[PDB]
Design an enzyme around this catalytic site. Structure first.
Site, mmCIF file in Angstrom:
data_model
loop_
_atom_site.group_PDB
_atom_site.id
_atom_site.type_symbol
_atom_site.label_atom_id
_atom_site.label_comp_id
_atom_site.label_asym_id
_atom_site.label_seq_id
_atom_site.Cartn_x
_atom_site.Cartn_y
_atom_site.Cartn_z
ATOM 1 N N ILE A 1 1.312 -0.942 -0.337
ATOM 2 C CA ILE A 1 -0.372 0.259 0.180
ATOM 3 C C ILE A 1 0.455 1.562 -0.041
ATOM 4 O O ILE A 1 1.837 1.258 1.017
ATOM 5 C CB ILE A 1 -1.041 -0.268 1.088
ATOM 6 C CG1 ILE A 1 -1.721 -1.342 1.369
ATOM 7 C CG2 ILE A 1 -1.757 1.635 1.123
ATOM 8 C CD1 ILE A 1 -2.144 -1.670 3.304
ATOM 9 N N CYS A 2 0.989 1.774 -0.761
ATOM 10 C CA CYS A 2 1.671 3.653 -0.683
ATOM 11 C C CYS A 2 0.766 4.156 -0.143
ATOM 12 O O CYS A 2 -0.719 4.922 -0.892
ATOM 13 C CB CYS A 2 1.130 3.727 -2.484
ATOM 14 S SG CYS A 2 3.119 4.368 -2.678
#
Lengths: 153, 73
Positions: free
Chosen positions: A90-91
């Site tokens: 997850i960015c």
């Protein structure tokens, strides 16, 4: 060692204790088994988004110097999104450079829910999906719903 | 013992149960109180998906624990 991981364990315990006393609507989370450093969590597809109805599973891995460094959070469920990839990375800023001890796992999962509602197509882990979000929002919402029906229900 | 069930609206349901009660039995209690069919219910406890045929004790759900309820669609 001893003192570092005692403070982390005290803190993880406090977050867990708070979840039990005051359960939140946006997620549920807790230890997988014996080990307080390894949790699992669920997120509900936010109602307004293309992920509505879906239940998304994540893993949470606390470092030994928690909460001074962030946990490692990753989706295990497949999800169609510009800022989350095939491996469930997850960015999100607050999981890296913007991490603060004031944040909890519950607040992070909340922010991840915001990410499902309002994706950030300028910092894309999956350029393909990002381009679709940018230039055909209707296709994007269709495929998102399709993947939510296929993997998260 | 009592356990609680949180729903998508925010409402909490309260249920009277034993450690030996099966997930099916808990879905039945939810149907009684809210009218949601068991086949539509997905129950979750601290990150884990609760499956049919297993007991509350098998998942280490305890006095005053809180599950989350989601619907299938």
């Amino acid at each position: 060692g001893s003192h570092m991981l005692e403070m982390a364990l005290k803190r993880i315990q406090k977050e867990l204790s708070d979840l039990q006393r005051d359960p939140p609507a946006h997620c549920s989370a807790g230890p997988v088994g014996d080990d307080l450093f390894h949790w699992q969590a669920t997120i509900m597809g936010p109602p307004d988004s293309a992920y509505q109805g879906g239940v998304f599973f994540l893993t949470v891995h606390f470092p030994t110097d928690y909460p001074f460094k962030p946990p490692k959070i990753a989706f295990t469920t497949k999800i169609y999104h510009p800022n989350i990839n095939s491996n469930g990375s997850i960015c999100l800023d607050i999981l890296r450079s913007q991490w603060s001890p004031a944040l909890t796992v519950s607040k992070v999962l909340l922010s991840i829910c915001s990410l499902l509602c309002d994706p950030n197509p300028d910092d894309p882990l999956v350029p393909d999906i990002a381009q679709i979000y940018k230039s055909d929002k209707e296709k994007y919402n269709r495929h998102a719903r399709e993947w939510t029906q296929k993997y998260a229900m | 013992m009592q356990i609680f069930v949180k729903t998508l609206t925010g409402k909490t349901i309260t249920l009277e149960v034993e450690p030996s009660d099966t997930i099916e039995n808990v879905k039945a209690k939810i149907q009684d109180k809210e009218g949601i069919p068991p086949d539509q219910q997905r129950l979750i406890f601290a990150g884990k998906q609760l499956e049919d045929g297993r007991t509350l004790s098998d998942y280490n759900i305890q006095k005053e624990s809180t599950l989350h309820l989601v619907l299938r669609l």
